[PDB]
Design a protein around this ligand. Structure first.
Ligand code: C5P
Ligand code: MG
Ligand code: ZN
Ligand code: ZN
Ligand code: ZN
Lengths: 159, 159, 156
């Protein structure tokens, strides 16, 4: 059994005038994450952890701005494509764990919807997908609500 | 061979008039970590990694940060209950690794005592538990002594 | 079947005068990482992940002596030796570099090769990823550069 681990990181600024989308879930809130597309910090971190575990580089190498098929794709579509490319390299996904660091808003009521989005997109049972939520105890830009961070870890195995 | 990985993150402010308890070790210092519990940043991150690997949510959902029973709570007891919930869910713990980021004080002399506490609490041999120490090179709120961070990784197996 | 996971972290200040060395690769830039050796943030993070996985402490505990003055690729090979000595084989390494500037993409494959050579691993078991910090905090301002690592080992 040829197991591999991957880890992922993402951060985006938290600004008025964009929706707040994390884990494929749109969360009603006065601000949203700034970046390309939906700036879904959680799905990007997971996407990188999966590419990382398959040793397939990173999210930036896979999906560019000029990409004719993936310009106009949201972060769930990128995740589904990532899962396909991980399978192409010979790996089946075993589990995902993650942490969202956000001072606000409260994320607890939206976690299980995030897990269901991720589980569906990866064709995993719900109980192989975990998402945890943290504040930053008012420390740094995260503590001041200037951005939201996601951290992810993934376990795969070669078929 | 049903292996799972979890990862954990925690940070707490460093303030005067608090005990400095990391990995269950009371460390002499002019300041201590601030929280609802004893604010043991390391144990909390490990606890989160273990809940994450078993896909049981997070430390927030299991133990409320606004509940008199948990005020000043011994984080080793929270870690021991976590281990119990991980077992009941059908997993055995294989290893824990972790990092504490603190600019001060020196943590190296206390590392082995931390490992001893964690190993006892998780009923693990010492050689499956690791704790590492880092400063933040005087960068950010961590580099300025305003808080302490912990990171953790945990490998479990469904048994 | 006795698998173990390890995780690593490192950060270093970005300063004028110093060469920028990440993953053993000298990258043209007006600033470089401040530290004892070449202050190779990436290699230190991977080194820590490896000691962590084998439960052998950390980089600072191993190289607190002779290893004062060593470059990070030397420390990494030595780390691998001590990990092998302890009875563990390395299965894979993954890592992320967080740097606002410069562009790291053109240098990633070369870092990969350096790490794989140093760990005596095939290229397809070593991975390096690049991130910016979206202009946030000391990382976003180019005050420093961070690396994260994760490692899987098996006790032989
Ligand atoms: N310093 C950096 C940071 C990111 N990159 C590349 O571009 C990145 C995309 O930038 P962000 O994802 O940080 O917005 C990474 O995915 C990586 O492929 C780089 O080449 N050098
Ligand atoms: Mg950080
Ligand atoms: Zn992103
Ligand atoms: Zn805590
Ligand atoms: Zn270093």
């Amino acid at each position: 059994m040829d197991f591999r681990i991957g880890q992922g990181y993402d951060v985006h600024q938290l600004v008025p005038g964009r929706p707040l989308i994390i884990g494929g879930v749109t969360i009603p809130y006065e601000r949203g994450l700034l970046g390309h597309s939906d700036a879904d910090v959680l799905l990007h971190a997971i996407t990188d952890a999966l590419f990382g575990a398959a040793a397939l580089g990173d999210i930036g190498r896979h999906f560019s701005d000029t990409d004719p098929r993936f310009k106009g794709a949201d972060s769930r579509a990128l995740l589904r494509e990532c899962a396909s490319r991980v399978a192409q390299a010979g790996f089946a996904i075993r589990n995902v764990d993650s942490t969202i660091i956000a001072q606000a808003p409260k994320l607890a009521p939206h976690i299980d919807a995030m897990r269901a989005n991720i589980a569906a997109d990866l064709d995993l049972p719900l109980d192989r997908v975990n998402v945890k939520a943290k504040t930053n105890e008012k420390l740094g830009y995260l503590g001041r609500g200037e951005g939201i961070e996601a951290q992810a870890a993934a376990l795969v195995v070669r078929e």
